[PDB]
Enzyme design. Structure first.
Site, PDB file in Angstrom:
ATOM      1  N   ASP A  16     -30.180 -23.338  -8.803  1.00  0.00           N
ATOM      2  CA  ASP A  16     -28.986 -22.548  -9.049  1.00  0.00           C
ATOM      3  C   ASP A  16     -27.865 -23.024  -8.140  1.00  0.00           C
ATOM      4  OD1 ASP A  16     -28.429 -18.930  -9.424  1.00  0.00           O
ATOM      5  OD2 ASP A  16     -27.558 -20.689 -10.399  1.00  0.00           O
ATOM      6  N   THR A  20     -22.635 -23.833 -11.346  1.00  0.00           N
ATOM      7  CA  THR A  20     -22.505 -25.267 -11.112  1.00  0.00           C
ATOM      8  C   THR A  20     -21.311 -25.835 -11.863  1.00  0.00           C
ATOM      9  OG1 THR A  20     -24.905 -25.365 -10.894  1.00  0.00           O
ATOM     10  CG2 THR A  20     -23.728 -27.436 -11.134  1.00  0.00           C
TER      11      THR A  20
HETATM   12  N1  ADP Z   1     -30.480 -28.019 -24.531  1.00  0.00           N
HETATM   13  C1  ADP Z   1     -29.215 -28.293 -24.144  1.00  0.00           C
HETATM   14  N2  ADP Z   1     -28.549 -29.357 -24.628  1.00  0.00           N
HETATM   15  C2  ADP Z   1     -27.290 -29.630 -24.249  1.00  0.00           C
HETATM   16  N3  ADP Z   1     -26.598 -28.896 -23.375  1.00  0.00           N
HETATM   17  C3  ADP Z   1     -27.145 -27.801 -22.819  1.00  0.00           C
HETATM   18  C4  ADP Z   1     -28.513 -27.432 -23.177  1.00  0.00           C
HETATM   19  N4  ADP Z   1     -28.801 -26.321 -22.487  1.00  0.00           N
HETATM   20  C5  ADP Z   1     -27.710 -26.007 -21.749  1.00  0.00           C
HETATM   21  N5  ADP Z   1     -26.728 -26.892 -21.949  1.00  0.00           N
HETATM   22  C6  ADP Z   1     -25.403 -26.866 -21.306  1.00  0.00           C
HETATM   23  O1  ADP Z   1     -25.596 -26.982 -19.902  1.00  0.00           O
HETATM   24  C7  ADP Z   1     -24.827 -26.018 -19.201  1.00  0.00           C
HETATM   25  C8  ADP Z   1     -25.778 -25.188 -18.363  1.00  0.00           C
HETATM   26  O2  ADP Z   1     -26.008 -25.818 -17.114  1.00  0.00           O
HETATM   27  P1  ADP Z   1     -26.525 -24.884 -15.923  1.00  0.00           P
HETATM   28  O3  ADP Z   1     -27.504 -25.632 -15.058  1.00  0.00           O
HETATM   29  O4  ADP Z   1     -26.882 -23.551 -16.522  1.00  0.00           O
HETATM   30  O5  ADP Z   1     -25.149 -24.690 -15.128  1.00  0.00           O
HETATM   31  P2  ADP Z   1     -24.801 -23.252 -14.524  1.00  0.00           P
HETATM   32  O6  ADP Z   1     -26.050 -22.897 -13.768  1.00  0.00           O
HETATM   33  O7  ADP Z   1     -23.597 -23.501 -13.660  1.00  0.00           O
HETATM   34  O8  ADP Z   1     -24.533 -22.411 -15.741  1.00  0.00           O
HETATM   35  C9  ADP Z   1     -24.140 -25.146 -20.230  1.00  0.00           C
HETATM   36  O9  ADP Z   1     -22.744 -25.441 -20.224  1.00  0.00           O
HETATM   37  C10 ADP Z   1     -24.720 -25.542 -21.564  1.00  0.00           C
HETATM   38  O10 ADP Z   1     -23.670 -25.702 -22.516  1.00  0.00           O
END
Ligand code: ADP
Ligand code: ADP
Ligand code: ADP
Ligand code: MG
Ligand code: MG
Ligand code: MG
Lengths: 526, 533, 159, 527
Positions: A58, A92
């Site tokens: 996170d 992030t």
């Molecule tokens: N299976 C996937 N394929 C492509 N993009 C994804 C997928 N799952 C999540 N994302 C993208 O990745 C991001 C989530 O990253 P994350 O590690 O959750 O960052 P944060 O913790 O800051 O939200 C989101 O913007 C989402 O659109």
């Protein structure tokens, strides 16, 4: 001896080098957690100064355990905390975006552009970003359980709990749904106080569940108390069931033979009177936040009542919500409506080598306990963080039912929209406007970089794809490195989260661009 | 190319002050060496010719003794394996009372021979199983070696003769006199009921006149003086009070509230009259001695003096309980007069001076009672302490004799017979445990060898003579101390006998300690840090 | 087994969540005169706790956690080389929780790694201090409310 | 160099392959230390604390706690083992070994450039298949006395030597059978474990009753009672002061004496109530009366009770109230407002035994106790500690066997069978996760390897013999620790808890997966 117009410990520095240092510090902060974004993220081990170990991916959890000296890094950390508290996800993304916009602004600052011009262009771009994001959103019917579960899955698909996706999604949805409440026309969710998460190491993670009630780490006060009650009538109290001194000074003066015995007998009779007042309501369980005297236990047990003492105030409020009771301090004023009927079972069972009190058949509870059982304490802490992210996302969707495409699709769509907007600016601010618009491509770029696929060809392909007419939902697959329509993959995230991310990133960039001088070393002057 | 790095893995993760000893040579052999060193340290104080050791602990106190348990207690041993052996010795001391040095010597010998067997090729498991088999065999054999039993315990002569051997290892020169003293003290105790209480024997040490002036008193002696003017009675009627000899006070808070001049002028007179009435009521029962555990008030003392009542104030609660047992009284909790059955009776209570010490004596003319005291005289504090240790050894021997009356010959006769029979058995059983069984049997030679070395003659000659004499079939033959040449004599005739229970428990505990030390393979020691207690 | 301090774990988890805006760090004193006039300043009622160092990290973290959860107290630390004590103090008397209040000594503990252990946590030291009666006996705001309180011209409705 | 060290100069960072190297080295070090623990033939360790306290142990969790280690990865493994011990009570050494071997096998492929995520996917697929196989292979069976004896033997033989384990097996099995009620959960709090330090280690046994670490505080009280009425009470029979600052005021000595006599009337009332009950229930001298109080009794009340032939104990443990209620059969009382013969227990023999300066009270010959006690007897403190740990492991093992309807073959047989099943299932796993599946199977095979190694036999040859026998016959054959030949653990009597194995699989897989995915380790919480 020196004249010392300022204090000797005052270090002052100003100029272009200050701006360069600030932007470099922000870039370093962004680089710390650059690889923690996406479904294929990698965890990090953090060594707490108190001896603890935090193993998480996170953004806010990682940035919270860093002691920095440069004030720009402190600002970035505060941004991360603000994003985490406001919406709960996208922590992030906001850090990465802030770093990228600050970099592209430094590019102009190297030239002879005044920072206020860059700030004005940034604010114009932020307004247009908000407009485009609201434009490309789609409505969501929250009455559809499957859609909410899919949203939560897309929320937690990037966390360690994504392996048990169905279980975690169902837990979060159930908790948020049954913590929803409305009194006097004011609606609330209130995940912070109610919907507690209790983690007990051991067992298997699939055994985790959300209870139709609450569970507290407490045991009956006396062995002869019943440990299993079918339909309890729970009564909650704050006041002690002991004999305590008053607030005033109340010295006695004994001169007769029997006055000592009389005093002791009156103490016992006062305890009996309190217990009789409680018994009058015919309860089954008595929970109190303070002590219960042994004589009080005997008097309650004479009436076949289970008593639990020294329960924390937060837990008592949660029980009151769960079983539909009311906390009463003075037992003599115990109305019938204060008795908690609705708890469909009370059971003090033993887990591991400790006693846990379960109230787990409440009819329509307004509070819940999420019972986590896992390999160890650190695994359970990470699972708790992921569940918190899921519940926050569910609450955000319930408050605002808008959704936007994920996986970098929204970023590229907004970037293309603002790039098309900038073709009619004709001013001098068109360059910073376009630059900050294109700075949004750092999210698809980071997704591709973490995926392992080639960055340049995929970004070029995606940018070309977004130049067509109906291509606002085209993003990058996070775990295969292929362009895909995100109304087919099924990755969406709440509009509120995206709006908050863009707002906070641009505001951080503006705040750090407004600074060209640092003065340090002066005392706090308390 | 000038430094050897720590190996990856556990070697690096170890803390700074910690030590990790693993493997056979680095752990087992070091433990065996430490235990052998401890046994060699305590060896010279074994037997009648054992020599005392001056031991000064960290508190500068001086100990002059040849009792192995006391030596080990005063020494601060730091090696964990030697600590384990010391624990075994102390457990033997607590369970029996005599035989600590035997435990230590046997354990040291067993571990030495175990190291020899490990070096010759035997595994640790084989050595351990052989030792256990041999211990079981020795415990089976031991009842067969019993020579004669106590067969009487109320007799003064038999008890003294039986206790002579226990208290001749310590204080070799003059053991008959100490045997008579301890025999009289023990026979005074130990009623028709079979139970015998060790704590019922009290020891008082009064400096001045050499240990030959020590005596046995059928009662109690306290090193203090009487409170009152009366110093002696002839038909004592002690009334023991566990409460302070003063007007009882409340428990919450006493406040004298005066509202008139008459109350003020009458308060002290009424209080004094009440105290006088209480003391007169006590005296009216015939109680001419009052023993209190609490303090003595001034007015109470004055009224006790007026009525010719002797006052003794005992500080220690244990002392009060022992006095009650000696006299047959009851520790009353109030200042109420005692009823007939709670009145203690003693033949005479008087204040006397012994040497330069003022003592109070509760003497019984009858040769009986519940507690008997051994008044020890001497010229040095250390000498009286050592005599007290010998007295404790004799009393523990008497207690063991009450528990079991079987005796086995001493002076290495039992050990040599055990070694002979175990060696003979070990030849019969085939397998790799025969070596361990033979070594276990050989370890018994360390006892007669230590005796012969301490007596000043050649040990090998004594051991060879013992084997020969036992080969013709005499199992009651041990080495003759009273000779300047290697010689043996029949131990049963000489009365040199030691308890069967002592040998049984000593062998069991020594074998257990040796086996438990052998079981340890890796040692992980933490940084010593502090921890004074 | 109430002697086992069941509440110790619960207090540990309570102190795990220090605050919102991070938990700051213990102030380090780099001058003997800085130490002197740091004791000199503040009011008499304000309690100041000092650490001398060169098992120190664990107790330093304990002070961090306490100061995070006890804002009233003014935990601080100083290097033994700054004061320049004797060889014995700089050798075998480093861990010493030094407590000041009003300029007079109240807690003069030295060699605390013995009477406090080495694996002790924040709750352990907190209980050790509170049983001495040395540690003095609340919702969380949004961020802030107050800017200045200088003019009492607030509200009036004179005809 | 790193970004963190740029922000915080005094920061320790290990990134990329450095993180994996550090974690795997720590795991391999822990595995190397704990290899010698596994199996009844493992070696003993003597652990010396800073204070100088000697502790002999062979338990994995105890050894982990008392190794002077300061490593983060070791801390995570220790936390996992702590949870495993807390919930199941057995399997900590196997836990550490499996984690270490999983990490080693995963590194074997990671060092060839393979991404850890593929290995983790293979691990998850293999864990699912292994759990299915373990469900298939478990032996559901109603557990009578002999099966429980076999399980207790399988645990205690690993913890202590042969004869001691043989004694402890009967002790723990009989205790569990005594306190267990049909179709009800087992409360292990009802088996008190008491330590004495006077006999040999083989004298430890089970008392069908209760043992207290204190005796009567009055010399005149009876030391032995034949027929006893047990009065479990929780009322302070000592003098208590007023809660509202009473204080006394008198004007003469006689008034003071009156106040002194009348200030003990309250407690004397409860003492007289007890005495009247005793007089009512037993009008002869044959039956005895025992009063066990959770609160103190002042000397005046002790004298008043002892004058009536009542033996009384004070300051009893809080758990002892429930224990005595379940054993003797009385009712624990918080007041004497209304007490009758109904609230009286029974005990066919009550006596005390004095050991040094400690008095122990025995309560025996109960009607049908639902709570018994285990008396640990040994010559040394470390012997008592070792026996206590072994008894805890054995009690947990028997309780786990009772709770589950099934028990699992031991001696590594199930590990071999699961490895074979995983290898057979490997082709059906799509992608490069087959490498992860192979690594998981090889890691599961650590247990028979370590057992054979500790027995002294050759590792690879013994393992290949076991595998060939299982493949050709299909039986659940494990390592024989005396000859090295395969043996059917079900027939011999080497049983393992199903819950322990399931927890092992789950926890080991989860922690290994999480450690493999760690890309860098940080410490920047200073300055
Ligand atoms: N299976 C996937 N394929 C492509 N993009 C994804 C997928 N799952 C999540 N994302 C993208 O990745 C991001 C989530 O990253 P994350 O590690 O959750 O960052 P944060 O913790 O800051 O939200 C989101 O913007 C989402 O659109
Ligand atoms: N007169 C004697 N001749 C030969 N051996 C004796 C004589 N008196 C005592 N012993 C031996 O001395 C041993 C006692 O040694 P001792 O110093 O008491 O050691 P411990 O106190 O450990 O028993 C006994 O085994 C006994 O056989
Ligand atoms: N008599 C035996 N023969 C063969 N294998 C055994 C025997 N007893 C135990 N085992 C095996 O040894 C393992 C027990 O090791 P143990 O020391 O209990 O480790 P842990 O304490 O971590 O469970 C089990 O897997 C069991 O199969
Ligand atoms: Mg997210
Ligand atoms: Mg002796
Ligand atoms: Mg085990």
């Amino acid at each position: 001896r020196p004249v010392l117009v300022l204090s000797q410990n005052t270090k002052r520095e100003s100029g272009r080098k200050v701006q360069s240092g600030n932007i470099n510090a922000a870039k370093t902060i962004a680089d710390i957690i650059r690889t923690c974004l996406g479904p294929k993220s990698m965890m990090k081990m953090l060594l707490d100064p108190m001896g603890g170990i935090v193993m998480t991916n996170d953004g806010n959890a990682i940035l919270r355990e860093i002691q920095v000296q440069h004030p720009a890094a402190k600002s970035m950390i505060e941004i991360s905390r603000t994003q985490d508290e406001e919406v709960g996800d996208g922590t992030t993304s906001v850090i990465i975006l802030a770093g990228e916009m600050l970099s592209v602004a430094e590019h102009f600052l190297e030239q002879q552009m005044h920072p206020t011009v860059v700030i004005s262009a940034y604010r114009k771009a932020l307004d247009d970003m908000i407009s485009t994001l609201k434009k490309i959103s789609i409505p969501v019917d929250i009455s559809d359980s499957d859609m909410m579960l899919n949203i939560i899955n897309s929320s937690i698909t990037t966390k360690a709990i994504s392996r048990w996706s169905s279980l975690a999604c169902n837990i979060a949805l159930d908790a948020v749904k049954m913590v929803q409440f409305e009194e006097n026309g004011r609606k609330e969710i209130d995940i912070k106080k109610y919907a507690r998460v209790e983690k007990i190491p051991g067992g298997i993670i699939e055994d985790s569940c959300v209870l139709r009630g609450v569970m507290i780490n407490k045991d009956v006060t006396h062995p002869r108390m019943r440990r299993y009650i079918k339909n309890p009538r729970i009564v909650l109290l704050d006041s002690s069931l002991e004999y305590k001194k008053g607030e005033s000074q109340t010295d006695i003066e004994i001169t007769r033979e029997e006055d000592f015995t009389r005093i002791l007998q009156m103490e016992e009779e006062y305890i009996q009177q309190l217990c009789e007042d409680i018994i009058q309501l015919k309860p089954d369980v008595v929970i109190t936040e303070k002590g219960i005297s042994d004589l009080a236990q005997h008097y309650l047990m004479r009436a076949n009542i289970t008593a639990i003492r020294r329960v924390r105030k937060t837990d008592n409020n949660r029980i009151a919500r769960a079983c539909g009771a009311r906390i009463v301090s003075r037992p003599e004023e115990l109305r019938e409506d204060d008795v908690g009927t609705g708890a469909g079972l009370l059971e003090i069972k033993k887990i591991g080598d400790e006693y846990f009190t379960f109230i787990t058949d409440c009819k329509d509870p307004k509070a819940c306990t999420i019972l986590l059982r896992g390999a160890s304490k650190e695994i359970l802490s990470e699972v708790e963080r992921n569940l918190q992210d899921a519940m926050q996302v569910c609450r955000n969707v319930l408050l605002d039912p808008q959704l936007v495409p994920g996986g970098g699709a929204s970023e590229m769509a907004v970037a293309h929209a603002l790039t098309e907007k900038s073709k009619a600016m004709t001013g001098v601010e068109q360059w910073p406007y376009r630059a900050v618009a294109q700075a949004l491509e750092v999210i698809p770029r980071t997704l591709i970089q973490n995926c392992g696929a080639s960055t340049i060809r995929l970004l070029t392909s995606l940018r070309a794809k977004h130049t067509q007419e109906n291509c606002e939902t085209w993003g990058v697959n996070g775990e295969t490195g292929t362009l895909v329509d995100m109304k087919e993959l099924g990755i969406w995230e709440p509009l509120a989260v995206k709006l908050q991310t863009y707002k906070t990133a641009v505001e951080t960039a503006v705040l750090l661009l407004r600074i060209d001088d640092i003065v340090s070393g002066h005392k706090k002057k308390g | 190319a000038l430094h050897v790095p720590k190996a990856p893995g556990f070697a690096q993760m170890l803390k700074e002050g910690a030590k990790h000893f693993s493997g056979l040579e680095e752990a087992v052999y070091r433990n065996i060496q430490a235990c052998k060193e401890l046994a060699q340290t305590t060896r010279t104080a074994y037997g009648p010719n054992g020599m005392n050791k001056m031991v000064i602990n960290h508190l500068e106190k001086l100990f002059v003794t040849n009792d192995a348990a006391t030596i080990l207690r005063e020494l601060e041993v730091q090696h964990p394996a030697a600590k384990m052996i010391v624990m075994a010795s102390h457990m033997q001391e607590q369970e029996v009372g005599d035989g600590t040095n035997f435990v230590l010597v046997f354990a040291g010998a067993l571990l030495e021979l175990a190291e020899e067997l490990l070096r010759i090729g035997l595994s640790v498991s084989e050595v351990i199983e052989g030792y256990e088999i041999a211990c079981r065999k020795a415990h089976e054999i031991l009842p067969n070696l019993v020579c004669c039993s106590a067969k009487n315990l109320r007799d003064i002569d038999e008890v003294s003769s039986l206790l002579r051997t226990s208290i001749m290892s310590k204080q070799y020169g003059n053991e008959v006199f100490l045997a008579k003293l301890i025999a009289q003290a023990c026979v005074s105790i130990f009623p028709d009921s079979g139970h015998f209480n060790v704590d019922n024997i009290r020891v008082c040490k009064i400096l001045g006149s050499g240990i030959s002036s020590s005596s046995v008193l059928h009662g109690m002696v306290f090193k203090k003086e009487t409170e009152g003017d009366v110093t002696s009675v002839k038909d004592a009627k002690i009334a023991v009070y566990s409460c302070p000899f003063d007007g009882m006070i409340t428990e919450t808070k006493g406040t004298v509230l005066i509202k008139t001049a008459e109350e003020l002028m009458n308060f002290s007179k009424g209080e004094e009259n009440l105290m006088d009435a209480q003391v007169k009521a006590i005296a009216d029962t015939g109680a001419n001695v009052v023993v209190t555990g609490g303090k003595v008030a001034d007015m109470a003392l004055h009224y006790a003096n007026k009525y010719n009542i002797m006052l003794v104030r005992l500080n220690s609660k244990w002392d009060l309980r022992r006095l009650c047992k000696t006299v047959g009284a009851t520790a009353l909790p109030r200042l109420t007069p005692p009823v007939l059955e709670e009145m203690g009776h003693c033949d005479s209570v008087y204040l006397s001076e012994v040497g330069d010490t003022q003592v109070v004596v509760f003497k019984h003319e009858k040769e009986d009672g519940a507690i008997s005291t051994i008044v020890l005289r001497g010229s040095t504090d250390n000498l009286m302490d050592d005599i007290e240790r010998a007295v404790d050894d004799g009393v523990n021997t008497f207690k063991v004799l009450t528990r079991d009356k079987r005796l086995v010959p001493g002076g290495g006769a039992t050990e040599i017979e055990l070694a002979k029979q175990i060696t003979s058995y070990g030849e019969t059983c085939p397998g790799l445990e025969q070596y361990a069984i033979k070594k276990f049997a050989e370890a018994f030679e360390a006892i007669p060898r230590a005796l012969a070395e301490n007596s000043g003659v050649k040990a090998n000659e004594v051991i060879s003579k013992l084997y020969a004499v036992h080969q013709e079939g005499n199992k009651n033959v041990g080495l003759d101390i009273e000779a300047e040449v290697p010689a043996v004599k029949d131990m049963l005739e000489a009365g040199i006998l030691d308890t069967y229970l002592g040998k049984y428990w000593a062998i069991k505990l020594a074998t257990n300690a040796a086996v438990t030390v052998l079981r340890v393979d890796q040692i992980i020691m933490a940084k010593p840090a502090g921890g004074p207690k | 087994f109430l002697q086992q301090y069941r509440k110790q774990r619960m207090e540990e988890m309570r102190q795990q969540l220090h605050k919102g805006p991070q938990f700051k760090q213990v102030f380090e004193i780099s001058s003997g005169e800085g130490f002197l006039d740091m004791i000199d300043k503040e009011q008499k009622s304000i309690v100041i706790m000092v650490h001398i160092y060169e098992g120190t990290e664990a107790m330093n973290g304990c002070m961090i956690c306490l100061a995070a959860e006890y804002p009233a107290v003014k935990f601080c630390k100083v290097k033994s080389s700054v004061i320049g004590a004797s060889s014995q103090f700089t050798r075998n008397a480093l861990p010493a929780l030094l407590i000041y209040k009003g300029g007079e000594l109240i807690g003069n503990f030295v060699r605390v790694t013995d009477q406090l252990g080495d694996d002790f946590f924040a709750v352990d030291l907190e209980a050790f201090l509170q049983e001495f009666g040395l540690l003095p006996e609340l919702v969380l705001t949004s961020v802030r409310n107050s800017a200045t309180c200088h003019s009492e011209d607030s509200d009036l409705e004179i005809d | 160099m790193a970004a963190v060290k740029t922000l915080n100069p005094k920061a320790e960072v290990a990134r990329a392959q450095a993180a994996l190297a550090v974690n795997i080295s720590a795991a391999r070090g822990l595995q190397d230390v704990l290899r010698t623990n596994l199996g009844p033939k493992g070696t003993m360790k003597m652990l010396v604390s800073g204070a100088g306290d000697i502790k002999l142990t062979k338990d994995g969790n105890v050894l982990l706690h008392e190794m002077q280690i300061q490593h983060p990865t070791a801390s995570l493994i220790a936390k996992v083992a702590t949870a495993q011990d807390d919930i199941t009570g057995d399997g900590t050494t196997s836990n550490v070994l499996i984690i270490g071997e999983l990490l080693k096998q995963a590194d074997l492929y990671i060092s060839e450039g393979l991404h850890p995520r593929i290995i983790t996917e293979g691990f998850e697929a293999a864990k699912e298949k292994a759990l299915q196989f373990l469900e298939e292979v478990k032996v559901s069976r109603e557990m009578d006395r002999e099966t429980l004896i076999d399980v207790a033997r399988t645990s205690l033989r690993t913890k202590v030597h042969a004869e001691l384990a043989d004694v402890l097996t009967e002790a723990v099995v009989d205790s569990i059978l005594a306190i267990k009620k049909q179709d009800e959960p087992i409360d292990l709090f009802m088996i008190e474990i008491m330590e004495m330090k006077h006999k040999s280690e083989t004298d430890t046994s089970l008392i069908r009753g209760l043992v207290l670490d204190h005796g009567a505080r009055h010399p005149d009280m009876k030391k032995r009672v034949e027929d006893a009425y047990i009065l479990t009470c929780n009322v302070s029979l000592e003098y208590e002061k007023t809660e509202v600052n009473s204080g006394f005021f008198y004007k003469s000595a006689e008034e003071r004496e009156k106040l002194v006599k009348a200030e003990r009337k309250f407690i004397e009332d409860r003492v007289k109530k007890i005495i009247e009950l005793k007089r009512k229930v037993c009008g002869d001298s044959d039956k005895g009366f025992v009063v066990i109080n959770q609160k103190g009794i002042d000397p005046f009340s002790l004298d008043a009770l002892s004058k009536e032939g009542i033996v009384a104990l004070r300051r009893a443990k809080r758990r002892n109230m429930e224990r005595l209620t379940l054993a003797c059969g009385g009712v624990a009382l918080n007041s004497f407002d209304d007490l009758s013969p109904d609230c009286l227990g029974h005990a066919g023999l009550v006596y005390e035994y004095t050991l040094g300066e400690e008095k122990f009270t025995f309560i025996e010959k109960c009607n049908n106790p639902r709570s018994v006690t285990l008396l640990i007897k040994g010559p040394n403190k470390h012997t008592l500690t070792q026996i206590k740990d072994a008894v805890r492991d054995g009690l947990r093992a028997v309780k786990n066997a009772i709770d589950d309807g099934c028990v699992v073959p031991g001696a590594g047989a199930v590990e071999v069978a699961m490895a074979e099943a995983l290898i057979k299932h490997k082709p059906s796993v799509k992608g490069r996760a087959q490498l992860g599946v192979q690594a998981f199977a090889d890691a599961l095979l650590i247990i028979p390897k370590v057992l054979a190694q500790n027995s002294g036999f050759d590792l690879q040859e013994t393992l290949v013999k076991i595998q060939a026998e299982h493949s050709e016959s299909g039986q659940l054959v494990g390592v024989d620790l005396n000859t090295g030949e395969p043996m059917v653990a079900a027939e011999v009597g080497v049983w393992d808890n199903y819950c322990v194995k399931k927890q092992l699989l789950h926890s080991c897989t989860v922690i290994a997966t999480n450690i493999l995915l760690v890309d860098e380790i940080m410490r920047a919480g200073m300055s």
